Amino acid sequence: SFKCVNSLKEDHNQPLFGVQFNWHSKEGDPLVFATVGSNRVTLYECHSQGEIRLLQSYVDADADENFYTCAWTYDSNTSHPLLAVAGSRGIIRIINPITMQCIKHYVGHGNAINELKFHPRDPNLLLSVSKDHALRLWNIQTDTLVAIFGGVEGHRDEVLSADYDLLGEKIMSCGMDHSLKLWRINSKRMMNAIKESYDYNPNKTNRPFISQKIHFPDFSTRDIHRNYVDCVRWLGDLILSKSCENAIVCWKPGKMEDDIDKIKPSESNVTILGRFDYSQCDIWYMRFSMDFWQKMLALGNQVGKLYVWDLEVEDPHKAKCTTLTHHKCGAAIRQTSFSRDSSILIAVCDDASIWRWDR
């Protein structure tokens, strides 16, 4: 299946905390991915014979910035790919990946940003999750903060991950308080707030843009993991999430037969559909990724082993596991990313190394 065809290491020797292929690449352009670590983001092109061609980095003016995360979208007018980055300074930067110019930046969290995700249908809706316990939804077309997901009934410690579902109607977040929380964004209130965000132009009005303050998740559980929950992804109506306890759990809110859209905020049950165990992944901030079609799931561990689960089976617990090791790959893997066509898998490590695996 996958063979390791190349690796390299970036000059800073600090952890690479994230990697993302650009799935908005144009037809016939080469496959491109971004790595984030130290105070930089770097872009690379994949070519034949395993070649990983260095392009150009964005390096923050602050030597104390530490980028943790990035996410791709495109300009909704021009179609050109854009790259969002954020980390310990709690500043989101929107980067033109061609020139690596910082086009604009957003401050709110003031506090470390642990993850960024873009809405699956609307390239302007960017979600950030913070060390300050909140999530925020931004509209990067009109430069507005649409809503803050917080309150004492929100997370009570750093939020580490979040994911929108397929249509972008709800978000599942998770973090250091051991919980997973659901926030619906297709409520009348949230749909109106999005609509109003698009109508906002500070040059044609006197008002500040009002953000929603969302203080009540639509569902919450602490019954999946018993430690920091550091990665979550929807799989249709089910959830995949992990902690630092050497398992990915496949679960859903409520009882086995309960529709996700009839779950009420007081729902006190969850249903466990399976659990994928693996070894030596006790440190936290270790993210799995899926391929475009959500046929598979890849995770690295803290000693440089990859696990890949084939989810193309009739029930989540029947997933088929493949492992990939290389004798020289021994550092902690923080994140993986598949190319859009699934032909390439990249893993990035705590020693600033980058590993390329082709089918």
Partner: peptide
């Protein structure tokens, strides 16, 4: 639990 191996 730590973030990075010691």
């Amino acid at each position: 639990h730590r973030k990075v191996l010691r």
